[model samples]
Target: GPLGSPSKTSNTIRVFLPNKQRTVVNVRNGMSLHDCLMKALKVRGLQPECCAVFRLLHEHKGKKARLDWNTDAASLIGEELQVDFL
Candidate 1:
């Protein structure tokens, strides 16, 4: 398994929960939004099933944009994210 050492850049992003709790998650460059969301949920001690009824929103200035789970994580660097119930 020591073929080519692959190093993907990772960064910390913020996620605001429905409870108004804030948590920071470290995500890899190539990971999907779903992957990052899972990590954030784990950090909040939430079960994976919670993902089913939860939605991701990207907050920019005063506007919020809904995000799909399959979207790339790299595009979300340094942004404010919020998780809401569906």
Candidate 2:
């Protein structure tokens, strides 16, 4: 499913994807998750909507790993995963 809306604050946008998987991505303020998804898709030559879901994971000072977001279905998976944006 696709959705669109306005942000209450500037320099920020929120997008919600349907599904139950998760992904961990490193993001900064004023950045679009949509753009990140597009880069991931282009690296693998896939349609954005069909990619694997990503959970935003945060690592604490001494923690192994923690999920900031849950893993949901994404457009691609496995070795096909690539970060085209640097």
Candidate 3:
């Protein structure tokens, strides 16, 4: 969450596509979520520019969150995280 050393749990995150295609990624917290997605894509051989309107889905029913690409990613897995890359 800040520019400091990260722990194991805080370094791992659940990244997903809109339709539930997800993966557990180990990335740094200082970088942006978009950056993490890019790295994940390269690793999985899935390359899709995040050109669409960025959207972050929430856990609550009928609730979703729109996020800033310029911000750091929220780690600590098991949360409602949808990594939209298309």
Candidate 4:
């Protein structure tokens, strides 16, 4: 799993798998959430609309963290996705 980005200002890091699966790891930062998702999707040959955004609600830590949705892949980076079935 490759990590980190060339731009030091980037708060998000990415990991790529041999199976054409990818994951974006985001840390606390000021970057727009939309931009982060776009970059991640591009790496995996996926479209932005094909993915979904999510955040984890950590009860024990009393904190929340965002997760990127991978529609064609299994497992989220580390959080559950908020989806609307309608």
- Enumerate clash totals for all models, in the order shown: 0, 22, 1, 0
Best by TM-score: 1
C-alpha positional error of residue 43 in candidate 3 after TM-score superposition, expressed in Å? 2.2
lDDT of 1: 0.56
Model 1 spans with C-alpha error above 4 angstroms: 1-10, 48-64
Score residue 7 of candidate 3 by CA lDDT.
57
Candidate-wise lDDT, in order: 0.56, 0.33, 0.53, 0.41
Off by over 4 Å in 3: 1-9, 18-20, 51-61, 74-79
Candidate 1 vs candidate 4, TM-score winner: 1
* Top lDDT prediction, candidate number: 1
lDDT of 1 by residue, 1-86 (tens): 11122345536656666686777767676865457667666556775445432324433255445555665555655545566554
**Lowest summed lDDT window (length 10), candidate 4:** 70-79
lDDT of 3 by residue, 9-59 (tens): 466555665555677666564755556667667876765464433344443
Give the per-residue Cα lDDT of candidate 1 at 30: 81
Tens-place lDDT digits, model 2, residues 58-81: 332443322122332222211112
Deviation (Å) of 9 in candidate 1:
9.2
Clashing pairs in 1: none
